Amino acid sequence: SRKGKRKVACIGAWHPANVRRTVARAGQLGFHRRTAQNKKIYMMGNGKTPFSTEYDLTSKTINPMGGFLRYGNVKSDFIMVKGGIQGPSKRVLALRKAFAPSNLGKDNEEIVLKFVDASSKKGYGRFQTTEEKKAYFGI
Amino acid sequence: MKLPRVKELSADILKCGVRRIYLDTFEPSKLSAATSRDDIRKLIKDGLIVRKAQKIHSRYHANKLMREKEKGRHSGPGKVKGSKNARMPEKDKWIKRIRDLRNTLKELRDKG
Amino acid sequence: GSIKTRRIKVQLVSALKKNRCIPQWKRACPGFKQQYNFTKRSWKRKTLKAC
Amino acid sequence: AFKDDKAIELTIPMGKITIDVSKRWKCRIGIRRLKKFITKTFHDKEAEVQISPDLNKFLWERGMRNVPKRVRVRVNQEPYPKDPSKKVYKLSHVVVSTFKGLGTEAIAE
RNA sequence: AUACCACACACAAGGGAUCGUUUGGCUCCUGGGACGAGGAAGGGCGCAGCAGAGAGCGAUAUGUGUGGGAGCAGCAGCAAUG
RNA sequence: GUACCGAGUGAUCGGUGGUGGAGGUAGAUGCAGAGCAGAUCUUGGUGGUAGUAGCGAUAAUUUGUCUUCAGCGGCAAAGACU
RNA sequence: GAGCCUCUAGUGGAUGUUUUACACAUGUAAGGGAAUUCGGCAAAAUGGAUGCGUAACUUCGGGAGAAGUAUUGGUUCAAUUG
RNA sequence: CAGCGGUGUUGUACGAUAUGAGCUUUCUAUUGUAGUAGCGAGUAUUUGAGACACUGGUUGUUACCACCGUCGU
């Protein structure tokens, strides 16, 4: 086709003699308010107290090797939640108690952790602590 | 006497291209005062106008490659693009052979 | 070009002498009313047809 | 000039300041951005920057599609002759074997 | 409508209508109806103290004779020996 | 020619103040190339669109220095191309 | 005297800004492999030289580079065109 | 901008030294002895080397305290 392929071809009929608000057009994308309902708290803790599971007997903080990419190390209290969340690193968010309780079985189940990943987020991260890196390489 | 013209007349006098003429920087007044070919001849004598040397293009690799090909290096099946006959002409092989053989017979007969 | 006939050369010679402005003294003369010579030409804008 | 008429000697990270610039014109736009770096380092946007021919010649050494990673330069500050309401900064090339250990120095004369 | 757009009036721009003027045109009438081998009509090229076009003139390119008589339009020079 | 003011149902007519610098009417009759919004009318002059659309196929350009008086103009040193 | 690279000789300006979307010249792509479309249109794949091996039909000249397969750089040697 | 810590990407720098399928027999002193070599793809050591980035860790050095306008009391 001539005059471009990445477009809506037909934007209306002859009558009514105007464009309808329901047809797609080019413009702003992203930077909108959105609310995500019923996300579940897996863990709560502090950035400088080490922790362990019943199965992983290493003792480590939440901070990965070298920190989070454009942030560094967590120092205060933290929450951990399932799945992804709006916006990039460093943006402010508002938290609220759930508006109504959920009936779904996936939501209301218990959670028991056995491992948490603490490897580097830059490149392929292949160690969980500096002690392992020092032991893999010499000296 | 504009300086572009000084270069043209110098190029004529020194039998080279305009790209080889160097005008000395410290006496532009002395250059600009020139009127004639005989002025330019004097400036050339005094070294205020100079012919530069040619840019270098050495045959080092060409010679090296040539000697290697004389030893028989390169020249394998993955280095040739023309037919056997293009590289070593067949009519020439014939013509070289039969002239030698005929010359051999001629001398043997004539010497008895 | 460099090769010319005698007839072509005289046409060029005459066309070259006629191509001049009004001399600067004439402008001062009491009776004289011309501004510019309208018969002046440019090689970029007209052909002589000397061929 | 600067405090106590010293020259400042510094190193310019040409590799970093050109990270976004196109390969086809790297050396042409690098010159515009070397001058910009100087003016922000001495907080003097409206001032002139002057590049000595030896520094020009060092920068163009591998043609238009490249620029050196680091370059060491001596800087002098003077009032600008054509309009002495402005300053001019003059850049000179300093030849170094290695960059290890070289910080920012101020040298007398 | 602070500043945009429109209209009215005063001043400045932009264009050349109108009125005043005319060493040109047109029509009718009367006279005339005169070229060339003794080289015509028509074409070209030259000629000025400063001179392109046009006018005038032919290497004698403002000469001779007759009748008159005051200047040659600019600048430099000429003129009752015209 | 331009602002105002009066007369007439109306086609039009009259006066006043500035501008202009030499010609102009009222009555009765005569002769006509005798009245314009239009013709994708004819000629000349001017808008909105608009400081907008565009002005950049090709090898490529940087630094200093003099002019220029503000020309990537000239000259030195580099980097490229046919 | 192909394309690509250099010597002799010759060469260049509408300024700054990292510059969204849609374009125009181009690159690359998991698994699938013409399901796309009037239609494999466009693109991809094959490619030089050396050897082995080559069908129907034919006017016996051709078909024929049929098809199908293998080899290829650097170094150091023998042997003399294999 | 540099040190010194930390986290990555690529794959083992330059230069030396040793080895290398093979091919070769040169020189100085001097009568006869001693001295006495060249040419070579590559491979191993020094060397998880060298290069390059980012650090909300820590030390040193260097730069920065202005100015112009509008509305109000």
GROMACS .gro file of C-alpha atoms (C1' of nucleotides) in nm, chain E residues 11 37 46 58 77:
model
    5
  422C      C1'    1  -0.231   6.166   1.016
  448A      C1'    2   2.442   5.004  -6.700
  457G      C1'    3   3.350   5.350  -4.183
  469G      C1'    4   3.177   5.896  -4.796
  488G      C1'    5   3.938   7.546  -2.738
   0.00000   0.00000   0.00000
